[PDB]
Design a protein around this ligand. Structure first.
Ligand SMILES: CNC(=O)c1c(C)oc2cc(Oc3ccnc4cc(OCCN5CCOCC5)ccc34)ccc12
Length: 296
């Protein structure tokens, strides 16, 4: 019910003429993310590279409404290190709606991890390590615990929706309309929609129920993505009626190549058939904190 949420223009509004738009970072059918240089958006008179989400040719007012609600919910949620951080917006009549967020150096985590297979050691500068992987996992859990505290749920948690910034900081985001879900293999046709079936809890697939505990299921799939270094979930499996049936039966993914035993058990915990029996994000924060310390 985001339509009732406030937009404080005096706080958030940024002039369009102080935003210099550049190269596209991601494009969907109706939306896009573009790199930009913003003059004095978060620090007085200093240029800052940012990312801005806006609509594309083909978009209608319905997509405009959706982007406005997205802005409003980001304001409601507020700032956390592990959520993509809202810097401002351009909402004034006479131009397109633009939502401005912090630029994350390395882009989406799925593509990044997939690029580091030859630059990984469990325990070499700029090499990824097991510590990095557990650290990213811990950070996403922290971000999701925060989102839950704001009475919000994600509904599309996956490595493609995690951003990697400098100093190994990861941030939860949602590309949304800026992703081409009709062309993206991660989204499968189900009824009158294209859905991320491989990341979805059984109750979401079968009953269309979305809760923080279905986000926990998705977090388990995310963990699998991290510890496979960006592999595609359910390798060599056709995503059809039989897949969904077997999933409800209790079929689960095998351990990914770079996992630890306790990380794999954590995945299995997140994939409990009963939503209430899955760990909470607060439990996951505690556990992954312990695992990160045990690693060091
Ligand atoms: C709920 N709202 C949102 O999630 C988002 C809003 C309002 O704007 C966004 C913009 C997003 O895209 C990016 C944000 C911040 N930084 C990004 C950096 C990107 O790529 C960096 C450059 N890459 C590095 C890797 O090699 C290729 C080039 C791509 C996309 C980026 C993601 C998510 C959002």
């Amino acid at each position: 019910h985001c339509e009732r949420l406030p937009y404080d223009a005096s706080k958030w509004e940024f002039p369009r003429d102080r935003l210099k738009l550049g190269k596209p970072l991601g494009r969907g059918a109706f939306g896009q993310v573009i790199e930009a240089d913003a003059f004095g958006i978060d620090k007085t008179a200093t240029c800052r590279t940012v990312a801005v989400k806006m609509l594309k040719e083909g978009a209608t007012h319905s997509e405009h409404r959706a982007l406005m609600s997205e802005l409003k919910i980001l304001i409601h949620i507020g700032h956390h290190l592990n959520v993509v951080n809202l810097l401002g917006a351009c909402t004034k009549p006479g131009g397109p709606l633009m939502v401005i967020v912090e630029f994350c150096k390395f882009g989406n985590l799925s593509t990044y991890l997939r690029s580091k297979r030859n630059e990984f050691v469990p325990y070499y500068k700029d090499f990824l390590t097991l510590e990095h992987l557990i650290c990213y996992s811990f950070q996403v859990a922290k971000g999701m615990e925060f989102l839950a505290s704001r009475k919000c749920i994600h509904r599309d948690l996956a490595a493609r929706n995690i951003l990697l910034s400098e100093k190994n900081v990861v941030k939860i985001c949602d590309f949304g309309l800026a992703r081409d879900i009709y062309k993206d293999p991660d989204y499968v046709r189900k009824g009158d929609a294209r859905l991320p079936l491989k990341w979805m809890a059984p109750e979401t697939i079968f009953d269309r129920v979305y809760t923080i505990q279905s986000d926990v299921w998705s977090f388990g799939v995310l963990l699998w993505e991290i510890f496979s270094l960006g592999a595609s979930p359910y390798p060599g499996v056709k995503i059809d009626e039989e897949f969904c049936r077997r999933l409800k039966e209790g079929t689960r993914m095998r351990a990914p190549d770079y996992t630890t035993p306790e990380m794999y058990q954590t995945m299995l915990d997140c994939w409990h058939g009963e939503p209430s029996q899955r760990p909470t994000f607060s439990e996951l924060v505690e556990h992954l904190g312990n695992l990160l310390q045990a690693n060091a």
